[PDB]
Amino acid sequence: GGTDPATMVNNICTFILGPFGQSLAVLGIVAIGISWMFGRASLGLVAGVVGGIVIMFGASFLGKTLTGGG
Amino acid sequence: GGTDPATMVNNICTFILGPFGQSLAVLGIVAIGISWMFGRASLGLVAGVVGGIVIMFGASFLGKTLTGGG
Amino acid sequence: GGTDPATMVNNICTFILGPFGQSLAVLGIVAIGISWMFGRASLGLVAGVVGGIVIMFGASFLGKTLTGGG
Amino acid sequence: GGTDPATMVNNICTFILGPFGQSLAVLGIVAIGISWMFGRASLGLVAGVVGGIVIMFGASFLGKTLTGGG
Amino acid sequence: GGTDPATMVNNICTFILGPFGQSLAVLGIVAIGISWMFGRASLGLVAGVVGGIVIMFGASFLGKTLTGGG
Amino acid sequence: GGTDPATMVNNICTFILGPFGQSLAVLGIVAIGISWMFGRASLGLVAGVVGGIVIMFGASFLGKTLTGGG
Amino acid sequence: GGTDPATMVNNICTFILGPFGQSLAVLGIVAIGISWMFGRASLGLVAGVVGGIVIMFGASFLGKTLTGGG
Amino acid sequence: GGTDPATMVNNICTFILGPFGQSLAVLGIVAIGISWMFGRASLGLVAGVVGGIVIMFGASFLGKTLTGGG
Amino acid sequence: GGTDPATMVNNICTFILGPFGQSLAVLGIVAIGISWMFGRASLGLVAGVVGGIVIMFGASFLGKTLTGGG
Amino acid sequence: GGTDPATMVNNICTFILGPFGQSLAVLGIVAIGISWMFGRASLGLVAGVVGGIVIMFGASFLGKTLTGGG
Amino acid sequence: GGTDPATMVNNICTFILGPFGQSLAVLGIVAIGISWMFGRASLGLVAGVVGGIVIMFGASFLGKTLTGGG
Amino acid sequence: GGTDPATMVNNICTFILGPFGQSLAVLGIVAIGISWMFGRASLGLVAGVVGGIVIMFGASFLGKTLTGGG
Amino acid sequence: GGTDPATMVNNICTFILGPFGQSLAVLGIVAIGISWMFGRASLGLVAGVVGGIVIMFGASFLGKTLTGGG
Amino acid sequence: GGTDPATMVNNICTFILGPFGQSLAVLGIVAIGISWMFGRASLGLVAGVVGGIVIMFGASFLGKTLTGGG
Amino acid sequence: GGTDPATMVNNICTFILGPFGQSLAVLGIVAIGISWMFGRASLGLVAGVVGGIVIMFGASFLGKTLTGGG
Amino acid sequence: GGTDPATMVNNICTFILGPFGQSLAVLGIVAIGISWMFGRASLGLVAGVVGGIVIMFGASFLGKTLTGGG
Amino acid sequence: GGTDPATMVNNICTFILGPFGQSLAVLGIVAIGISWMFGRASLGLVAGVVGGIVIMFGASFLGKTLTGGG
Amino acid sequence: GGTDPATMVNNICTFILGPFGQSLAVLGIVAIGISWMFGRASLGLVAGVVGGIVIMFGASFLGKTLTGGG
Amino acid sequence: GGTDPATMVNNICTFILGPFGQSLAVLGIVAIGISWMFGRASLGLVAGVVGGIVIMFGASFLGKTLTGGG
Amino acid sequence: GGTDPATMVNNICTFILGPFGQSLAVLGIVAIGISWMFGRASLGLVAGVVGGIVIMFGASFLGKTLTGGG
Numbered sequence A, B, C, D, E, F, G, H, I, J, K, L, M, N, O, P, Q, R, S, T: 001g002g003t004d005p006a007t008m009v010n011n012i013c014t015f016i017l018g019p020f021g022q023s024l025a026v027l028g029i030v031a032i033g034i035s036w037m038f039g040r041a042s043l044g045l046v047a048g049v050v051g052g053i054v055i056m057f058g059a060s061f062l063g064k065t066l067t068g069g070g
């Protein structure tokens, strides 16, 4: 029948971390610039968004390190 | 006839904690990065997801310790 | 003819609390880790599942204490 | 007379996991987008529907692994 | 008799993603503007609704990528 | 019988973005002036309400641009 | 049955910008004089309250200019 | 059906960084001049708003540098 | 026998939107004043109740516009 | 004898989607306004009722599209 | 049998806006004085409570103006 | 023999809406006060119980209006 | 046989509003003091409990006023 | 049964504005003297507390003037 | 059988306002001292806890005054 | 033959409200303490269980008061 | 046959309040320390868990006091 | 079973005001010295921490004086 | 069958307070250092986390002291 | 199955305090230099960030000292 479940979860990871994910990064950075004007600028806001991109992209390396193999 | 029920429940554990489970870990980590941007960053959110992977993977060791044998 | 009913109910208890039951414990723990990610983490969920294993395994001791003999 | 029952149950599996099943997948994904707007967005809702497609499609591989042969 | 079930599920997908779906998108965007006034403005609310339209429209591409064929 | 669903959703959009919507805009602006007195004046409050009117009115153009056609 | 919703929202605007609104203006000005004594006098406080009256009264003209018609 | 999700997120980026974004820049600069009068002038306020425009515009270059490709 | 069902549903609409409905409006407004004291005052609470009266009264006009005739 | 069953089911459809159905629409809208006051206002409640009228009225067009002929 | 529902809702309005309501007003004013001491004094707190009494008492006039008759 | 069925159903209505019904009203109101303490206070709970008394008492007037005669 | 139902419902009202009800009032007040310490103090909490006692005790007067007789 | 709700709310007002309220006034004044030493002395702090006593005591006169009768 | 419910609710009041309640008072005061250090000191925090003890202890007198008898 | 049915129902009441019932009370109280930890603490949970013991024990007095004799 | 039901309910109470209950207390305290880190520290959380142990252990004394004998 | 709740709350008070509390006092004083350097020195900071120790230690005397007995 | 429930709850306590718990302590301390940079430094944050480790580790001593034996 | 939970928490500590942590230190120091210009320079800001690095790095030594072993 259909492909094994191991392949499908790989397709989601490839799609998320592909061209779609890269265009999500620029949208998050834009929200920082829009928020600093018409509001208040702080180090906590910029650190949170940039930290999110670091965790999101390259999450495969984080998963391998935490699990210990793969 | 079919194999004994003790073997079948072992197959589920091997499948869950195999390559399928490892690709589930990276999807959970990705959701952390996506959530920190376009939202709010907190220590509770990251601790819950990372704690979930610790409980999920290596649950055999937790079961043996709690039961006391095996 | 067949064995007395007292022996048969002992066989069910031995089978449930044998290797089959131990592999059921690790499946319950896995469901905790899967649920904490892709969702919400709470103390009620972990307490209920761990409390279930405590009641399930060693139910013979609970039955003897409640009845008062055996 | 008619074909053996082993063949008929194969026809149902082929029909479900054929073009009919693929068009069911896109309807489930559409319900996610419709639900996020005019309502609330959560990780539990998207995880449940996507997890359903993973279980539904490729269920033959899950059945073979659980049974242990085929 | 009637048409095969594969055709009917295609008609639902075409109707949902046709002119009816496009007019649903503008209603979701209107609810964002109405909610920001007479209330509170946040990045989470706008991200959820816009993310919903992305998932809803073009769900056929998401289904093909996840399944792996079609 | 009744008109097709494509027409009904158009009637809601016309009614919302008609004379009713224009009188909603002046009510949102009034709430800014009432809030600045008997309280605190900030750039975040005025930006949120004015941004809401921009998103609400002309949401058809935003929907067409995001979808890519219509 | 009842009057159309377009008429009701007009009644709120007329009531707010009528005699009730004019007596709200004098209360806001009084709070400036009370605050300057028993406290500190600054240009920011007076500018915010007077700016609020300018936005509140005549909000119909601001709405027409922003929307572009009416 | 509809276009792939990779195209839609590109349309948002083009719209934000297009003529709409440029007119947002002049509104942020105007708020600096309005704030310096009827208030206090400081280097922190001007630096925050100008820094916001730098982050907002050209966020694609920042995303490419951080990710490392594209 | 009895009157046709078309007449009965008209009687309910006339009764609801008659003197009984008008006295329901003043009770809803009273709950706003009682809630602002002994609690917290917000724009969301007042907007929801006033919006409810607008939808409730004059619902015949909303029904005619949505349906497209009558 | 009596008329053919094809005619009777047409009479039910005409009666439901006639003047009786139109007066049912205004009763559903009234319940929205009554519910927003003396309670909580949400986008899910209004979307469900308005979506119901869209499905109910013009169900003939939905049936023709799904079936594929008529 | 009992009196018509139009009379009962009038009795609630008379009771609320009678001697019971007047003694509720003095309790709300007392909470302002108690809160200013043992705490912080602000214009927002006093404006909210006094605004609540204005909305609560005389809600009949507000209902008549909004509805447009009675 | 016995009295006609029209008389018996009148006796039930008189008994329910007599002294027995009035003492039922005070029991329903008491449950509101008991529930607000040792729990949570909300407008939905009080509105439901008070609305129930309005429907219960004076149901004869509601029946006459709906039927259209009597 | 037994007493009429009108007498029994009077006995419940007398018992609830007797010495038993008065001792319930002091328990509700105690919960306010216990909650303010080891937690947060707010005007909403005290108003809800005190309002509950007002509704509970003297509910006979509220029932008579609403019904209009007795 | 119990006394009417109009009497109970009078008892709260008498208790608050009785000997209990007078001893609350001296505690508020003491906090001014304690705060001026071991800290900073300002006209805003003393004005707020003394203004609170003026609003708290004699709130009945303020309520009568605002309402317009009683 | 058992004692009347009037006696049981008296036992709870005696137990709460007995030696157990007095030792609860000292625990609440301790939390004030622990909170002032390792944090911030304010008049609102101390007033809330001390006010809680006043309401908790001697709640019988408050209940008698509010009810009007006992 | 056997004893009259009036005696048997007395034996059940004596047994339930005897030593067996008293040991049931302590089990209900234990469930409160177990539930507050590993979960959430609320006033509704404790009030329900304690209210249950009040109704259960001393139900003879409640039955006599309601019936009016015995 | 078996022992009387009065003895069995005593065995449950002894088992719960024995060594098993004492080890449950330390698990509840551990959850406080784990929750304060990787999250937020508050007085409500610690008070609820410690209050639970007080109610759980020594529930026999609470049952005797409430019942009035034993 | 376990000890009465009056004893347990005494154990907490003894533990807090024992050797553990004395070592908490020196940690609070250390934070004053660390804060004066690498920062600003003020009389408000030292007064708050020293006042906290006075309230914390000897809280039993404060509780006895406030309650009036023990 | 399985071991008694008293042994299992001991295994959880040993595992939590073993090498796993010690490595949890260093993760909590790391979060303090990460939070002070890219944000704000305060005494409340460090006190809460360090206080959590004190409660978590050595919870057996706290349980013994509170219970009074073991 | 997977590795024991003791190993996974070690991997997180090694990763955080590895090359990733060292590059986090230089980013925190950069924020000090950027903040001193375009703003105000103070000893509190530099002390907080440098103190954060001291706590973050070498947190294993702090954990061992506090716990007392390992």
Ligand SMILES: CCCCC/C=C/C/C=C\CCCCCCCC(=O)O[C@H](COC(=O)CCCCCCCCCCCCCCC)COP(=O)([O-])OCC[N+](C)(C)C
Pocket: A044, A045, A047, A048, A051, A052, A062, A066, B040, B041, B042, B043, B046, B047, B050, B051, B054, Q038, S027, S030, S031, S034, S035, S037, S038, S039, S040, T009, T012, T016, T024
């Ligand atoms: C599986 C391996 C995963 C590895 C994850 C590695 C993370 C290291 C990353 C990045 C550096 C920058 C990113 C965050 C910076 C936050 C600054 C900030 O400021 O936010 C902090 C949040 O504190 C953090 O989150 C810092 C914690 C970083 C990770 C903690 C240690 C590693 C994970 C251990 C947790 C549980 C272990 C599992 C147990 C079995 C709050 O401050 P705020 O004012 O912004 O609050 C915003 C609230 N409003 C909007 C209302 C103002």
Ligand SMILES: CCCCC/C=C/C/C=C\CCCCCCCC(=O)O[C@H](COC(=O)CCCCCCCCCCCCCCC)COP(=O)([O-])OCC[N+](C)(C)C
Pocket: B044, B045, B047, B048, B051, B052, B062, B066, C040, C041, C042, C043, C046, C047, C050, C051, C054, P038, Q027, Q030, Q031, Q034, Q035, Q037, Q038, Q039, Q040, S009, S012, S016, S024
């Ligand atoms: C069979 C052996 C099983 C062993 C399990 C071992 C677990 C130790 C693990 C990990 C460290 C990090 C993982 C969780 C961190 C939570 C932080 C947080 O923050 O979440 C806490 C939850 O509190 C916890 O869960 C911490 C408890 C950890 C385990 C408790 C003791 C061991 C189990 C005893 C229970 C019953 C015993 C059986 C009785 C017979 C809530 O805070 P929140 O703001 O996130 O709420 C989120 C809610 N929103 C989204 C609305 C904001």
Ligand SMILES: CCCCC/C=C/C/C=C\CCCCCCCC(=O)O[C@H](COC(=O)CCCCCCCCCCCCCCC)COP(=O)([O-])OCC[N+](C)(C)C
Pocket: A027, A030, A031, A034, A035, A037, A038, A039, A040, B038, E040, E041, E042, E043, E046, E047, E050, E051, E054, F044, F045, F047, F048, F051, F052, F062, F066, H009, H012, H016, H024
């Ligand atoms: C489908 C196409 C849709 C296009 C939408 C275009 C929007 C651009 C518009 C406008 C300029 C002004 C309007 C908002 C200004 C906010 C200033 C402020 O201050 O609010 C900010 C909120 O941050 C924003 O929302 C700015 C974000 C603007 C849009 C973000 C990028 C575009 C959308 C991407 C999101 C997801 C993409 C989809 C992923 C597949 C918070 O600050 P606050 O202090 O007011 O917090 C108030 C809280 N209290 C009341 C407690 C203090």
Ligand SMILES: CCCCC/C=C/C/C=C\CCCCCCCC(=O)O[C@H](COC(=O)CCCCCCCCCCCCCCC)COP(=O)([O-])OCC[N+](C)(C)C
Pocket: G040, G041, G042, G043, G046, G047, G048, G050, G051, G054, H038
């Ligand atoms: C709706 C119509 C309202 C009409 C209001 C008319 C006002 C004219 C009045 C009075 C003459 C004396 C009263 C103030 C004298 C201040 C002297 C002083 O010295 O204070 C000045 C404050 O500057 C002023 O406020 C003067 C401005 C007067 C009004 C400005 C123009 C009219 C309003 C335009 C604002 C926005 C327009 C709306 C935009 C749409 C600061 O100096 P300082 O050393 O005392 O700072 C004290 C700080 N420590 C304590 C730390 C040392």
Ligand SMILES: CCCCC/C=C/C/C=C\CCCCCCCC(=O)O[C@H](COC(=O)CCCCCCCCCCCCCCC)COP(=O)([O-])OCC[N+](C)(C)C
Pocket: E038, F027, F030, F031, F034, F035, F037, F038, F039, G009, G012, G016, G024, I040, I041, I042, I043, I046, I047, I050, I051, I054, K044, K045, K047, K048, K051, K052, K062, K066
């Ligand atoms: C049916 C006819 C009804 C007519 C109602 C007329 C109202 C005019 C009244 C009064 C003047 C003073 C009373 C409120 C003053 C607020 C000041 C304040 O400060 O509160 C503002 C709230 O903003 C307001 O509510 C002002 C809005 C006034 C009415 C708005 C326009 C009329 C209604 C349109 C809404 C929807 C229309 C229907 C659509 C179909 C927030 O500031 P905060 O710092 O206190 O936040 C407190 C939060 N903490 C405690 C955490 C700090």
Ligand SMILES: CCCCC/C=C/C/C=C\CCCCCCCC(=O)O[C@H](COC(=O)CCCCCCCCCCCCCCC)COP(=O)([O-])OCC[N+](C)(C)C
Pocket: D038, E027, E030, E031, E034, E035, E037, E038, E039, E040, F009, F012, F016, F024, I044, I045, I047, I048, I051, I052, I062, I066, J040, J041, J042, J043, J046, J047, J050, J051, J054
């Ligand atoms: C058949 C024709 C029907 C026409 C209906 C027309 C409605 C326009 C009306 C009014 C202006 C003011 C009334 C609501 C203001 C809400 C402000 C607020 O604040 O509430 C918003 C709710 O968002 C809204 O509902 C705004 C949406 C307005 C209508 C949306 C577009 C039209 C209908 C499309 C839906 C589906 C289409 C059918 C698909 C086939 C939430 O914010 P919250 O903080 O109050 O949450 C309260 C929660 N707590 C209590 C916990 C804090």
Ligand SMILES: CCCCC/C=C/C/C=C\CCCCCCCC(=O)O[C@H](COC(=O)CCCCCCCCCCCCCCC)COP(=O)([O-])OCC[N+](C)(C)C
Pocket: F038, G027, G030, G031, G034, G035, G037, G038, G039, K040, K041, K042, K043, K046, K047, K050, K051, K054, N044, N045, N047, N048, N051, N052, N062, N066
């Ligand atoms: C129903 C009838 C009610 C009648 C109420 C009558 C009030 C007149 C009373 C008193 C004279 C002294 C008492 C307050 C003095 C404040 C000085 C101060 O300094 O505080 C001012 C607050 O501004 C005021 O509140 C003055 C306003 C006085 C009343 C306003 C006009 C009457 C009410 C209209 C409001 C809405 C109308 C209803 C709309 C339908 C702030 O300055 P701050 O530095 O202390 O800020 C402290 C903040 N930290 C601690 C961080 C530094």
Ligand SMILES: CCCCC/C=C/C/C=C\CCCCCCCC(=O)O[C@H](COC(=O)CCCCCCCCCCCCCCC)COP(=O)([O-])OCC[N+](C)(C)C
Pocket: I027, I030, I031, I034, I035, I037, I038, I039, I040, J038, K009, K012, K016, K024, L040, L041, L042, L043, L046, L047, L050, L051, L054, M044, M045, M047, M048, M051, M052, M062, M066
């Ligand atoms: C048959 C005659 C019955 C007469 C009943 C008379 C009642 C007047 C009484 C009392 C003054 C104080 C008592 C409540 C104060 C609430 C303050 C508060 O704060 O609670 C408000 C609730 O809003 C109210 O309930 C005020 C409404 C008062 C009555 C409304 C008008 C009369 C009844 C009309 C309803 C339907 C009519 C029938 C239609 C046919 C919510 O705010 P919260 O933050 O506490 O939410 C707590 C939620 N957490 C815990 C999560 C934070």
Ligand SMILES: CCCCC/C=C/C/C=C\CCCCCCCC(=O)O[C@H](COC(=O)CCCCCCCCCCCCCCC)COP(=O)([O-])OCC[N+](C)(C)C
Pocket: K038, N027, N030, N031, N034, N035, N037, N038, N039, N040, O040, O041, O042, O043, O046, O047, O050, O051, O054, R044, R045, R047, R048, R051, R052, R062, R066
């Ligand atoms: C049950 C019996 C309890 C007895 C309690 C006895 C207390 C007397 C004690 C001590 C002398 C020194 C300790 C505090 C010194 C504060 C100096 C300071 O400066 O702090 C004051 C705070 O004002 C106080 O708290 C002084 C009040 C002292 C007690 C008040 C009267 C007794 C209690 C009555 C309250 C309610 C009664 C119950 C009603 C039924 C604020 O100034 P700040 O610049 O530090 O603000 C810091 C804010 N930042 C960090 C942003 C700069």
Ligand SMILES: CCCCC/C=C/C/C=C\CCCCCCCC(=O)O[C@H](COC(=O)CCCCCCCCCCCCCCC)COP(=O)([O-])OCC[N+](C)(C)C
Pocket: L038, M027, M030, M031, M034, M035, M037, M038, M039, M040, O009, O012, O016, O024, P040, P041, P042, P043, P046, P047, P050, P051, P054, Q044, Q045, Q047, Q048, Q051, Q052, Q062, Q066
């Ligand atoms: C049969 C005899 C039984 C005797 C029971 C004796 C109890 C006294 C005990 C202890 C002191 C500390 C323990 C609880 C402290 C709560 C603090 C807190 O904070 O929790 C309060 C809960 O309010 C309480 O439960 C205090 C009530 C204490 C007992 C009430 C009076 C006695 C019983 C009368 C009830 C019915 C009588 C029967 C009628 C016939 C809520 O606040 P939260 O922010 O934590 O909400 C948490 C919600 N989240 C997680 C979302 C933030």
Ligand SMILES: CCCCC/C=C/C/C=C\CCCCCCCC(=O)O[C@H](COC(=O)CCCCCCCCCCCCCCC)COP(=O)([O-])OCC[N+](C)(C)C
Pocket: O038, R027, R030, R031, R034, R035, R037, R038, R039, R040, S040, S041, S042, S043, S046, S047, S050, S051, S054, T044, T045, T047, T048, T051, T052, T062, T066
């Ligand atoms: C488990 C073992 C852990 C050991 C931790 C050891 C820490 C010693 C370290 C370092 C020297 C420099 C680092 C901080 C310097 C702060 C200077 C500053 O200025 O900040 C101080 C903060 O006061 C501190 O935090 C100093 C306290 C240092 C530790 C306290 C004693 C040890 C821990 C005891 C706490 C609880 C014990 C557990 C109870 C069971 C505030 O002043 P600010 O103007 O910057 O406020 C900034 C606010 N704005 C941005 C608005 C202006």
Ligand SMILES: CCCCC/C=C/C/C=C\CCCCCCCC(=O)O[C@H](COC(=O)CCCCCCCCCCCCCCC)COP(=O)([O-])OCC[N+](C)(C)C
Pocket: R038, T040, T041, T042, T043, T046, T047, T048, T050, T051, T054
């Ligand atoms: C990780 C290694 C980091 C190494 C950092 C090395 C720094 C040495 C650098 C530079 C020489 C010139 C740069 C600053 C000159 C300030 C002159 C001035 O005047 O400003 C001083 C500020 O006092 C300083 O900041 C001097 C301190 C320099 C460093 C302190 C010792 C090293 C770090 C120890 C701190 C905590 C240790 C960690 C604990 C575990 C204030 O005076 P102001 O009138 O300008 O106030 C301006 C206010 N208005 C605008 C209102 C007038």
